[PDB]
Amino acid sequence: SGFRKMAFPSGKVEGCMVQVTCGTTTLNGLWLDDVVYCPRHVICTSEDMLNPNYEDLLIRKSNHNFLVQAGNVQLRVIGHSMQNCVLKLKVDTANPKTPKYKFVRIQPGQTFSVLACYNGSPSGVYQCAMRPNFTIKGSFLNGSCGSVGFNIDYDCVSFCYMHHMELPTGVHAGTDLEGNFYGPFVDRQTAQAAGTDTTITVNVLAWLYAAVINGDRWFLNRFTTTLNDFNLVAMKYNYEPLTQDHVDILGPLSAQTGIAVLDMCASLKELLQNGMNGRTILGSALLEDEFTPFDVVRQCSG
Amino acid sequence: SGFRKMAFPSGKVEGCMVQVTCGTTTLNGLWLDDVVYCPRHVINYEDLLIRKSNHNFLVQAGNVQLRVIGHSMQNCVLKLKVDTANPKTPKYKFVRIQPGQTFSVLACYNGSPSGVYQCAMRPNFTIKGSFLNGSCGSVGFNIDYDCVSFCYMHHMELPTGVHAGTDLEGNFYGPFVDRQTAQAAGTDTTITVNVLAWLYAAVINGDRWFLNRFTTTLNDFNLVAMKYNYEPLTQDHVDILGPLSAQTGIAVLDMCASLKELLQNGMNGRTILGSALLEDEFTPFDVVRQCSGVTF
């Protein structure tokens, strides 16, 4: 019993964190096999904030300009290349602690663990979700760039995010491990605004199923809804549209609890209308949207 | 910016988790040096233990079976001596924590780490954990520099879905016993010093709507705290929050006046750090560590 915002154990990623220094800038790098991955903005000077030409800045660098530190050992950079917004520093030593891993690009609503790092050293681990506006609500200070987001399945680490920047609203933007930004963001200090964020409806429904599995039913009602009427209502509270894919995805939790998806949708519509009336659901007075259907099944069933 | 429920990096503890099987029961063990610690309920415990041989305890560390060469009990923990010291043993201490203190839990099943989450020792000595059958022996810890302070070992789940366990010396937190008998968690209260720390975290992150011009006395605040099932705030708590008070410019009794108003009037549709409830599972130290980026 119980339901917590649970992160993956971070050890497999901790053994990959290194410090990358280029000039006056120091940030984190991810050392997998003989490559260190990090944000390409590590090559920017104070004059390359707004409109850096990374190809031009990179061509001027030598391998010995990149100082890479793995624990108390300086690694030797023997090559460098850029892939989209990530810099790949070839090193002369393969990381002996390289886990089984994959690079995966995630979709909005997906969750992942973040291992926040400073100076190549892990500081903490927390659970995140890719918001519908492609930002993440992380906890990051200056120096956290290059910290990564990941999931673990079996003994395989799926790296899905690399931290690049904080937007004016305190939310965070980054890329996958192929250097492609999530969202319409660029690794320039030109003014960029996150689009209006919305609630991840499918995740709220998953969390209501988690509540039912854990013994709570107070929010259930005798009603159902059509998918279209639900979306018309949900949109008025800035909830993401619920698609037939989301309904299908909720099938297993529906079968386990005996509450049809559209019946849970009617419960959600009522909660949006009434609020909680001093009650909580799984220790929260707000509807939680950073647990996916897959997270609920994993945490509640194994 | 941002403020998350953040756990310590778990790698140092992951390299200590092993599976312990005794008869039909399988649970987790903590392998430090040449000893595996686990709940004694894996087995009148003295009478049940005397009947066991070393080979009855099957200990698996990854894909390797360890050899048990001795067994002894310390309070509610069983100590299985093994023939091999754990090469991954970190620098560690066993520490007993107090209610209100937080720690990270590395939830494990079959000796394999499944997740990590941060929680607090409730004033009623339970933890609002997230555990399924097979999670016994999972541990709670804090990290200071490179030293792991192990403070909790999971033993059981109470009827309300909350959890009970011991320190690593086998002493239960709370008035619980390791017997398959209905036991109830006492009425819980809110960890006041932690709520104040989290309000300071909100101020540091730009959430100031709940601030007010008022201050209060420690005694008047505690009278209001008692009324709302909040733990008493001591002068030690006030002193502990001193750094956050100096950083934000909000004296602890000034934050207490903000807290009193929140308790008597509610949030009025507003939130603080993304919560519509007052969060009490961040200590003043947690706030300073997170809002300053300390590493391990």
Ligand SMILES: O=C(Cc1cc(Cl)cc(N2CCN(C(=O)c3ccco3)CC2)c1)Nc1cncc2ccccc12
């Ligand atoms: O965010 C950067 C550095 C950084 C990298 C890159 Cl690739 C881009 C940019 N920009 C992003 C977009 N932009 C704006 O939209 C803006 C701010 C004010 C008005 O407009 C300007 C800066 C900033 N670092 C840091 C990463 N994470 C947490 C930090 C918490 C404190 C301080 C820094 C942190």
Ligand SMILES: O=C(Cc1cc(Cl)cc(N2CCN(C(=O)c3ccco3)CC2)c1)Nc1cncc2ccccc12
């Ligand atoms: O709680 C035990 C096993 C266990 C160990 C020991 Cl030392 C004692 C006891 N009991 C004494 C405490 N008690 C109650 O007060 C209670 C619950 C329901 C009715 O009464 C439960 C029986 C149970 N395991 C598990 C650990 N964590 C999560 C689990 C989630 C599902 C199932 C089991 C889990």
Ligand SMILES: [Cl-]
């Ligand atoms: Cl995805």
